[PDB]
Amino acid sequence: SGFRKMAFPSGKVEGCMVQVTCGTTTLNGLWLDDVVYCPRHVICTSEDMLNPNYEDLLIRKSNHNFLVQAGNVQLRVIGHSMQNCVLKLKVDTANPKTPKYKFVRIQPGQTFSVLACYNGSPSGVYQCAMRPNFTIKGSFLNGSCGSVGFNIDYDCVSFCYMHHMELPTGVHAGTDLEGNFYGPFVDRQTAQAAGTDTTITVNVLAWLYAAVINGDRWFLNRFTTTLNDFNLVAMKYNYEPLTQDHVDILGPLSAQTGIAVLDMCASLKELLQNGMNGRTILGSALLEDEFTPFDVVRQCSGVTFQ
Amino acid sequence: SGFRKMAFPSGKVEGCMVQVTCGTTTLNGLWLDDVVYCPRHVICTSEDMLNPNYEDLLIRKSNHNFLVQAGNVQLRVIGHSMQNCVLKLKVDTANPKTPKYKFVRIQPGQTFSVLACYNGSPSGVYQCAMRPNFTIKGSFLNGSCGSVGFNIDYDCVSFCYMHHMELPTGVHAGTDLEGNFYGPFVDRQTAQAAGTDTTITVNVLAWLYAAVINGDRWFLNRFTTTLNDFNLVAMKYNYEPLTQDHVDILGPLSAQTGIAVLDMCASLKELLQNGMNGRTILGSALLEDEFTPFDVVRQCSGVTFQ
Fold first, then answer.
1. CB-based contact, A57 to chain B, within 8 Å
2. Contact, B109 vs B87, CB < 8 A?
3. Interchain contact B270–A (C-beta under 8 A)
4. Which of B15, B131, B245, B257 has the smallest C-beta neighbourhood within 10 Å, fewest atoms?
5. CB contact under 8 A, B124 and A9
6. DSSP states along B105-148
7. Helix %, strand %, coil % for chain B, to 5?
8. Domain residue spans of chain A
9. Does B124 reach chain A within 8 Å, measured CB to CB?
């Protein structure tokens, strides 16, 4: 028992992290086979940052401008190209620690593990969800550009996030590993801001199921509700609509707990209308929305990864 | 910016995790140099569990009774011995992935990373604090015995915890890597229970400093208090006494924020007496006590590990 915000074991990703230096700028890169992936902003300088001009900036670069350091070993850059907002540096050495991997873009409401990195050296690992407004509530300091987010499925690392910057509310924006931003953000300094967020309804229901599995039942009740009548209450509290697919995805959890999805919606309805009256759920005084149904099943049933 | 419950990168520990099987019991072991460490309960059977008798149980064992599997490679056991509640299996192969390490026992109130493992295969990583009552609020399912907790300091893994079992409130008890329990627990089934806990006062103050560093200032006030007058309020709310050493340890955080430790105590006093009035601190509606001063400095300043 117990329920924790739990990341994937980071070892397979630690073995891919390198340091990329261009001019006076140093950030993290991701070394897979013979390519290093990193944010293209590494080729910018402290006055190029205002409205840069990246095709122009890159044509003025040569391979020898890029210093790639894998631990205490220098990698020779033999080619460079840009894909959207990422730089791809071909190096003369394939990473012998390359795990099996995919580049996968995630959906808002989905979670992933972040390996925070500085100067190519992993610092910590934690779990994040992609918010409905395509930001993540990360923990990043200066030098963390190029840190990656990922999920692991058996032996295969699905990279989904590369860190690019911090928005003025302290939330974070980045790209998938094709260099495409999540959300309406750019790798510049503009006045860009997150914009309105919502709570991930299906995740909150998954977490209530996790609580029931773990022995917190005080919030249950005899009531039920219609999907329509629940969604009307969700909308005043700034919760996302719940779909039949969400109901279907919650099926397995509903099955082991014996608590119909619509019954749990009734409970959430009451929690939203009454608050928690001084009590806690899984050690939280807030309705928690950054665990998916999959995360709950994984931790309340116990699969591993090789 | 941002503040997350962040674990150490788990790669150096993933490379030490093995599977130990004795009879019909299978759990996790920790392979360092040519020794595998694991809970001695692996030599128990489903009726030996009531009041076992471990010196007797072990003398009846031979090396070939122990099957050690490092991934898909079988390790040959050449010696076995018991140290308190851990078994030490000498194997004929030194782990080529042995990091530099120490066995260090931690204090209540200190934090560490846990690599949850099943059948020798790492499943996830999360951060825990050792509670004042010597339990940890972990996330463990059947098969997680022998999962380890650890801290990493530059390149050196300080192992501090081996998981042994779950108490009836769903909290967890285990040993240091010398086989000595944290707290008044035994590797048996008795009616043993956690017993009274308290909140880790110095950690809550560290977390309030983290919040100030991250822009949450609504809980600050002009007031100060005496260490004595604060400790009187701490005791009605079941908070640990605050010592001058705690004040000293909070010095650096007090210095970058410009908020005297005793001023922050006044703020905590008000938060304890008034609640949070619907607001949150670092995304929490509760006073959080499982980050140390060191954890806050590490994440709000950004050191890495090699």
1. no
2. no
3. no
4. B245
5. yes
6. PPPTT-EEEEEEEETTEEEEEEEEE--TTS-B-----TT-TT-E
7. 25, 30, 45
8. 1-14+100-197, 15-99, 198-301
9. yes
The residue type of A127 is Q
Query: In the CATH hierarchy, which top-level class contains the domain B198-301?
Result: mainly alpha
CA A230 to chain centre: 28
Q: Work out the burial of residue B274: count CB atoms within 10 Å of its CB; fewer than 13 is exposed, 13-18 middle, 19 or more buried.
A: exposed
Instruction: Please list the helix, strand and coil fractions of chain A in percent, rounded to the nearest 5, in that order.
Output: 25, 30, 45
Q: Residue A107, class by beta-carbon neighbours within 10 Å (0-12 exposed, 13-18 middle, 19+ buried)?
A: exposed
Q: Quick check: B125 and A4 CB within 8 A?
A: no
In words, the CATH class of domain A15-99 is: mainly beta
Residue closest to B153 by CA, chosen among B94, B113, B188, B207: B113
> What tokens appear for B175 in the block?
């040993």
Q: Which residues of B touch A283 (CB under 8 A)?
A: 137, 286
Residues of chain B with Cβ-Cβ distance to A138 below 8 Å are: 2, 4
Please state how this structure was obtained: X-ray
**By the 8 A CB rule, do B179 and B84 touch?**
yes
Asked if B176 contacts B148 with a C-beta cutoff of 8 angstroms, the reply is no
| Residues of chain A contacting residue B305, judged by C-beta atoms under 8 Å apart | 121-123
- Which residues fall within 8 angstroms of residue A275, CB to CB, at 6 or more apart? none
β-pairing verdict for A156-166 and A100-103: parallel
Q: Residue B265: which of B243, B281, B291 has the closest Cα?
A: B243
Please tell me the distance from the alpha carbon of residue A175 to that of residue A134, in angstroms, as a whole number: 10
* CB-CB contact of B153 with B102 (8 Å): no
**Fold match between domain A15-99 and domain A198-301:** no
Distance CA B275, CA B264 (A): 15
Topology, domain B1-14+100-197: Thrombin, subunit H (2.40.10)
Contact A4, A299 (CB under 8 A): yes
Rounded to whole angstroms, how far apart are CA atoms B197 and B175? 19
CB atoms near residue A280 (< 10 Å): 14
